Every structure is written in C-alpha cells, then in structure tokens.
Design brief:
- Helices cover 66% and strands 0% of the residues.
- The protein is an all-alpha fold and 134 residues long.
- Helix 4 packs antiparallel against helix 5 and helix 4 (41-51) packs antiparallel against helix 7 (102-121).
- The protein is elongated and about 50 Å long.
- The two termini are 18 Å apart.
- Inhibits signal transduction by increasing the GTPase activity of G protein alpha subunits thereby driving them into their inactive GDP-bound form. Binds to G(i) alpha-1, G(i) alpha-2, G(i) alpha-3 and G(q) alpha.
- This is Regulator of G-protein signaling 18.
Length: 134
C-alpha cells in the first residue's frame, strides 16, 4: 500500500473512491479482516469475479455458489443483505445472469459504508494513512 495523505483524506469524502482505489480497498479490507467481516467486501468481489466469466453454465454454478454461501440466511457466512434484494435473488437464482447479485453489490457496499466506513475513518489504519494520531 502506497497512498499519499492527500489521496487518503480524499477517501474520507467518498467510500466509492476508497473502495475503488486498490490501496483503499486494501486499507478498508484490513479493517474488515481484523474483526472477521471481510467476506462482505469479498461478497461482491466474488460477484464481480463471477462477472468475469462468460460461460452461462458457469454463471449458474458461481451464482448459486455465492448464493448459498452468502445470499442465504442458512449459509456458512450469511450476508446482512436487504431482504427485498435477496428475495429477488432467491426467485431468480434459478436464472442467473453475469452478476445476479448486481443489486446486492450495492446493498453490501452501503452496508459496509454505514457500518464499517465510519469507524474506518476513525480506525488507526486510516488514521495512519492520515498521519497524525491513532
């Protein structure tokens, strides 16, 4: 990770910037890893990894894989995903698309924003990028 304090303070005005920035996603994923909730950031990372596939049969596989692991309530991980979003997923997972979790990507994004991004801004990892005091 190599981020200038400027680019770093810039993360504190846009979670999307943070998250899209490789160094920022990295700062945030550290904060998310340390308390073991990293599978949210990697929830949609899985989805976009699946989005990288072009094989419709693989779409079924990867979608249902992410589905049963995350979208499920009865899952090994389980996401705190919006019920209406997961509802549509549960009904249309039978007919998956390149990223059937496209709406859920945004849900988990806003989840991490309101839950973790706030405290990330006050975390020593981000405050270290700030260079001042933990």
């Amino acid at each position: 990770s190599m981020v200038s304090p400027e680019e770093a303070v810039k993360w504190g005005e846009s979670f999307d910037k943070l998250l899209s920035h490789r160094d920022g996603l990295e700062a945030f994923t550290r904060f998310l890893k340390t308390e073991f909730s990293e599978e949210n950031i990697e929830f949609w990372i899985a989805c976009e990894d699946f989005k990288k596939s072009k094989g419709p049969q693989q779409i079924h596989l990867k979608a249902k894989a992410i589905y049963e692991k995350f979208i499920q309530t009865d899952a090994p991980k389980e996401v705190n995903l919006d019920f209406h979003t997961k509802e549509v997923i549960t009904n249309s997972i039978t007919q998956p698309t390149l990223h059937s979790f496209d709406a859920a990507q945004s849900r988990v994004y806003q989840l991490m924003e309101q839950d973790s991004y706030t405290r990330f801004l006050k975390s020593d990892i981000y405050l270290d990028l700030m260079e001042g005091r933990p």
